[PDB]
């Protein structure tokens, strides 16, 4: 009795152990945050378009010039092994299934290169900076492993302050590992690679990248680069001035800053000033939502949680459903608003409240 | 002790199968269409007029030119034998006996015909394109039966996405069917009769319905004609523009687009862009609900739950009730405020919240 | 252990038999009328003036030219004499203690004339009008008994829709009588005093009473006239414009109209209109809600409920009881905004919210 | 499982006698004033500033001219040996080894002298006048003792309504007592000496304290001189006018008047207007709290019951603990909106909601 993506949450936490479970729902401080992410998809109800001509309707979509099944996709989370077997491959699976990408996180279970051969879906990189030569190092394994798209997430300069973890005192599975650290040699006392093994036992990043680090990785980056973790038009502008293709607006689900704004707060400004793919993910559950926010002026939407109930409750299958039930709710609302080309959503169909 | 609306929904809940009621109290995914509704109400208070002879009060007025003993009318709702044995003529009898308007359900449970020779009110029929040629069928049905007005409903391109009868596995009462489909010939293999028999088979309609269609079935019907499910003043004026006598702003009850705004949201706009008879339903249980909107410009209101409550729980008197509390409701209400005649009613009455 | 209003509210539940009780504190339909008028308090808050010298504070005020100990009033409330022995008396006298004026209902237990024989208080009368001729036999009787300022009330044009007295059908208890109608002679089968016996068995009142009414009942009384139930600056100026010495906002703490604005939304606009005494009633609980409305230019506040709260729980004391801790609480008000002379108030210590 | 300020209020009020806890964590009247000191935080969410080098932060700021360890300080609170044995004194030696100023009440359980002489960190002393003589002797007795700043507290002209200690019939524990007025002489019979016994045998202080006294103060005191418990720009203004060296926006905690503004919502403006330290306090809990006043314009913020909390809970090492996580949390919090330098805070980083 699985019929949106609340049932495979309820689902999860029957199966997860409470100390996962919490790992994957937790935001962070109070959780004022991840509620904020979900109430203001409330500030907008829709205005349908009667007596359109509905009866073929077009989910399909290019990002960043790309043609998918429909805007959305699977974002870059962390440990997914601990939400089920060989999470990572199952999500990628599932996003190559339904015709949209997955991204893979820094911090994965499986590696880049595992993937990049178990999968030939569009895949796309997540990159955390830890060290700056270790990322060359993922950076290029991934572009070598034909990996599309590289993604920057830079709202992780210091850790997240989750209770949920902290009275968990949650510990990263044993089974499982950051396979894309694995192997990152030693032994190599000279100083500057004794300088590398302080920051891979530090579960703290490079709070230092800047702007001119993120020249240094335009460079290096041949393809589309995206920059994720902005909450406000001139950052995202100022990324597009440095040489970015894209952005992501993000607020990482509601799990770095408990006061953070909601991604959707800034979207239509971002838009409207970058004049650039601006993506957008943090709160969406339902296709409404997702719906709402294309209608703003977003390129396309990245699923977190969503996907990982289907993933935590199901495995593959899981994912597959939670796609299939989303693709089929975004269709609905279309058909509903009267917008059968899903590349026509317009500020248009929407009423703030 | 049934002094409300909301006396006979509990009552009936009492009554019916868990099933069915679900399929009567149910609405859209999470239900805040629904429950905005009703919310949206509160946006409204009155500032009555002191000191105003009221004594001789009115509620007599004219719909689409055509005078009945109150600005109210039991709107269009399938499967009403499933509510209550024949509750498609117990519910025309209470609106005749009430001296309003009944709208009959293109998938009601009795025919266009066994109700225009049992009963003679005001009769209207709401019309659902499934397949054009059967559509003709019933409006020319109809016609001949003596039904006033016809009444295009268009916010059901595809069904809406409604989780109770989901959970519930709900499936249309055995011994109950769609009387208005019966004997729909068959046995005619032409390959154009065929492929209506496919439609028959769908419990989803004509989503290409479209203006140019608005047009056909405006030279088809020569009464009044008006336009239901409409939720902008850009759509009302079109209507008007392509031949509608009126339309009538409705979200379904909040049964087909969750986050659909209220119909009250844009109903001072539609009134005065359109010119013409503005009708309205959604959400309406109190005669303070009623008038606020008459108010603002509303010809009438449509019932749907609310008399559709009297019904399920004491069948026809139970629809008398409900009616009969609801006229001394707005009777009262008027007195409140100081306009003993429901056509004074302005937004001068009220208070923006 | 009583503190304020609402504890005597909870000890007068915990005496008074549910039926009477419900009477007392029941309200409108859904009751959202009495839950705004309390939250409306909510939209002032406080902007105190510091080192300002509080040392000595009067709360002493004049009401329609005539000084009283402080600007309040137990208004005029129907059945006293159900709430406690002589509600009507104890609640004068304790009016009278206080240095307050007392306001008879027209439907009391106890007549104009015991009262204002046991009784030396400033008393007004809040008059009802069943039968013209009627209301000037009341008007006179309480002119020459020597009742100061007579308050007509106009929010009573038809019964209000308390549903709580519906579910526990309501009598006026046995013990009881209205007691200004009794000896309203009889036996005379004219047709004019048969057509008063008409209006003596109907719990209705003169619905046509209009303005013009107003100017008749405006020559019949010499002194202080004041129009109760005003819920509009428009109509309190057509009272002073009329010969009305003053206006009482209110709207019946609830009772009439539940959906009726809170008086508080139109005293600042009444107060800057009429440049006459605007009066003011309905929700008023704590002493800051008092001064927000003194603050607003509110001339005085009748108390409803709250003062009837320690007369249902302790008689005469209660009322002495609650009238002591709001003057405290009025005069610990005006200290803590560094406001010391009750006549300084001004929107100028107010912030809305 | 002590990981904020929230999780040691519970561990305090499962040690603390209900009554004490009560006198610590109540408010005034119905408490809605302690209840919307937090809720006013919610009105501004953080914008962050991507891709900005925070590896190196720095939370040390000028306060009155004087460097401190970071914009906090432990407030003057009165009956602190109450929560917890010798709490003047565990507090400001938390405070003290914070590298941060605290507060003594004049209302202490250990006298100007004895703190003095045992701690040797930045001490201010909070004054309340009683008595004009006596005031002078502890403002002398503070400045030779070489407390740097004095503090003038407006916002006690009366006690405040706070009901929580009327229904416990609170009394000040046997054990303890108000130091700073132990040894006031008596026996002194001469008038003027009389007319101090009673005002020390009054919990009521001199209402009379206006802006005249202010100036003899001014005079007096030749060190830092604050005004604390202002709540609008304009009475910030007169007290920088006056000679005040800044000032404290506050309510008091919400003990006061229960209706009260929040000092949020005058601190812009009293920022603007004074061109002056504008400290405060009031409702923080959170280093999101304290962040979203100083990127307001506040030059520090002043804690009450936070660090009581840690206090009560744990003596002194739960003062260290509430400071440390505070500290922590304000450092992690400049690190996730890009702003390295609490200094450079500005309304830039925020978002009205
Ligand atoms: C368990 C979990 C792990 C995450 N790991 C990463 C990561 O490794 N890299 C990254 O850029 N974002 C990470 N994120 C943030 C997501 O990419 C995404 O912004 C967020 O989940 C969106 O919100 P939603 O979950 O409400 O959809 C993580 C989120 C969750 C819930
Ligand atoms: C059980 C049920 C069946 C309905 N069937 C129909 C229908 O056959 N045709 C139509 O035009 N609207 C249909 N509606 C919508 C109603 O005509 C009306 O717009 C709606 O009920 C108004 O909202 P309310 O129920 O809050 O009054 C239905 C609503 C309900 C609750
Ligand atoms: C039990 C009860 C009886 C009342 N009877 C009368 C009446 O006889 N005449 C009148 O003018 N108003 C009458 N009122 C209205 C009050 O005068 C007053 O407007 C109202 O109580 C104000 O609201 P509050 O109760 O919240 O203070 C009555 C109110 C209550 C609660
Ligand atoms: C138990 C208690 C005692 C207090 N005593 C004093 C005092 O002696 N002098 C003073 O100026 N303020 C006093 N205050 C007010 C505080 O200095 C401060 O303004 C207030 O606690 C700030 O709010 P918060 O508790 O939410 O941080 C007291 C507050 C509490 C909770
Ligand atoms: C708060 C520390 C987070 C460390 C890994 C980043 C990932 O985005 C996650 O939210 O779990
Ligand atoms: C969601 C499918 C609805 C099919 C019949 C239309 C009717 O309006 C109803 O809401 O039940
Ligand atoms: C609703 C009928 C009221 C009849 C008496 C008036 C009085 O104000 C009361 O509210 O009880
Ligand atoms: C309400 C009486 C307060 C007397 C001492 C002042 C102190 O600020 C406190 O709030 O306890």
């Given at each position: 009795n699985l019929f949106n993506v609340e049932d495979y949450r309820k689902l999860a936490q029957k199966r997860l152990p409470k100390m996962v479970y919490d790992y994957l729902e937790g935001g962070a401080e109070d959780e004022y945050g991840v509620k904020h992410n979900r109430d203001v998809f409330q500030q907008w109800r829709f205005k349908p378009k009667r007596?359109?001509?509905?009866?073929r309707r077009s989910l399909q979509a290019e990002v960043l010039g790309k043609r998918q099944s429909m805007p959305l996709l699977i974002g870059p989370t962390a440990l997914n092994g601990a939400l089920w077997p060989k999470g990572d491959l199952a999500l990628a699976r599932a996003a190559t299934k339904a015709g949209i990408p997955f991204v893979l996180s820094?911090?994965?279970?499986?590696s880049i290169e595992d993937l990049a051969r178990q999968c030939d879906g569009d895949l796309w990189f997540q990159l955390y900076v830890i060290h700056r030569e270790i990322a060359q190092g993922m950076v290029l394994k991934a572009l070598h492993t034909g990996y599309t798209t590289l993604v920057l997430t830079t709202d992780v300069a210091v850790n997240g302050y989750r209770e949920r973890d902290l009275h968990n005192r949650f510990?990263?599975?044993?089974?499982?590992?950051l396979k894309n650290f694995?192997?990152?040699?030693?032994?190599?006392?000279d100083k500057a690679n004794l300088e590398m093994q302080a920051a891979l036992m530090?579960?703290?990043?490079?709070?230092?990248?800047?702007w001119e680090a993120l020249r240094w990785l335009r460079d290096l980056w041949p393809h589309k680069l995206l920059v994720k973790g902005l909450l406000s038009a001139e950052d995202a502008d100022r990324c597009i001035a440095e040489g970015a293709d894209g952005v992501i607006l993000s607020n990482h689900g509601g799990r770095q800053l408990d006061c953070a704004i909601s991604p959707m707060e800034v979207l239509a400004q971002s838009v409207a000033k970058t004049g650039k793919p601006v993506l957008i993910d943090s709160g969406f559950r339902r296709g409404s939502d997702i719906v709402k926010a294309l209608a703003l002026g977003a390129e396309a939407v990245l699923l977190g949680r969503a996907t990982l109930y289907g993933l935590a409750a199901r495995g593959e299958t899981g994912v597959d459903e939670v796609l299939t039930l989303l693709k089929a709710d975004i269709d609905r609302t279309l058909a509903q608003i009267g917008c059968?080309?899903?590349?026509?959503?317009?500020?248009?169909?929407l009423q703030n409240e």
């Open positions: 007596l359109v001509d509905v009866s820094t911090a994965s279970n499986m510990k990263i599975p044993p089974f499982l590992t694995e192997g990152i040699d030693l032994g190599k006392m530090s579960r703290q990043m490079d709070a230092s990248f800047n059968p080309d899903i590349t026509s959503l317009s500020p248009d169909y």
